[PDB]
Symmetry: D2
Subunit: 144 residues, 4 copies
């Protein structure tokens, strides 16, 4: 199941990432945009954004592997909680260029905001799935 | 936001509920099928199934209110964990009769299996949303 | 495993419960103090405190049974998240009057703050265990 | 807050670790035993045990830093869930040699079992705290 890095770069945030990542003008933000090919189709589009101030070093090779493992490796003990929001959205132009969308009109979009022990929003992920390629499992634990 | 009870009954399980609820032939299962009207449209279809042996008493009035609150009220201390599985599915005939599906072809389907302290699968819920009417939030808590 | 209700009453909050429950002077708060006898010893002291404004009706019989089930029954759908803090504390005078503390000097104290969908702190529980009678299990779920 | 590595080694499992880690005779297990000095006292004793087959490489320097971050870095995407069990135990001889236990007789013991996506128990941690130095926070998330 191959992973392709489409965009990857370190720049100031766009206005959307200023809102999503609570970042300023003068914050250096890593942007990584990838697609996943679950043979033989490109079906998920993964967009990560996180502050360089906390993760100063990154490479194209780390993105073709796991950004999660890399990030946990560098500062997993400072990461406190994440908040997930899963909705469905119309496909966008970016979605149709990069994924094999067949006769699909919508996506399942998982958004995830990762915060540090000190309370700051440090990372933002937007994971866009074709409908047939989305499955989310969890608990859930009940009682007192 | 009105709630309408379409089916409601106490019978032995169909073959699908035998699989979903790990129930036998000679188990009495409550089935409740409801739709939610988030004005002014019917947009969610909620199917609950649970054993009468654990919840012997039920009414149409409890279903028009909250089955969750009722169930927690009777045996919330025995409920241990739930497991959730969220996928997307094509709409079915039952979906089109009961919900206002406009020009919609798919649904977000949340399935939830609730287990007791003694380890048994006791309840099964299948909650079917029109795509624009689905939003799921959670944590997620990270670190050691 | 018998449950004994020692105090139970509806009054304005003490200064400690003002802090613990974020309640004012003119808020009516239910206080329930119970001990659990895990035969044949009294070993846990359970203190619950919650606003009457949200749970207007209560009885001694509900406390000898389950306050959790009762509360979930009345407003479980409005309850959003709880936050738990588990520490160890020296035993207090109240602990020695009401529990069989043998040659025990400390307690395991579980504190739990329950919040509503609207964001307000609605309930506070303080559960004090003798050391040998404390066991807490959980997950914990890992990965992306 | 300094970290001291007392034992560290790669051997077959003792009979206790065979039970705790579900390991055989012919499984190579890393054992790391550390104490934490929260100035100016040694107050926590951390025992980690995990299979070399999954983490082939390790050093004394990684243990003086974070084993969690290291492990997440190597295989965080394969880690599925953990299960935690927190109880209180009498102090042992190992506890009194390595920690400053003053006039303390008991410990808060946090045990944690980490499993992989494939279902196998892969790691076991036993974290022993002096009573005054234990605080555990969590959620807890409620409702349907
Ligand atoms: Na569609
Ligand atoms: Na003691």
């Amino acid at each position: 199941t191959k992973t392709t890095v489409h965009k990857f770069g370190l720049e100031p945030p766009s206005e959307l990432i200023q809102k999503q990542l609570r970042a300023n003008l003068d914050d250096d933000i890593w942007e990584v945009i990838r697609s996943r090919k679950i043979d033989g189709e490109h079906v998920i589009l993964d967009k990560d954004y996180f502050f360089r101030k906390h993760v100063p070093h990154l490479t194209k090779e780390i993105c073709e592997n796991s950004i999660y493992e890399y990030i946990e490796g560098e500062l997993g003990l400072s990461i406190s909680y994440a908040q997930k929001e899963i909705v469905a959205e119309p496909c966008t132009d970016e979605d149709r260029e990069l994924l094999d969308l067949r006769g699909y009109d919508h996506m399942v979009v998982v958004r995830n905001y990762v915060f540090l022990e000190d309370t700051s929003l440090f990372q933002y992920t937007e994971s866009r799935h074709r409908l047939d390629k989305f499955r989310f499992v969890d608990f859930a634990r009940r009682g007192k």
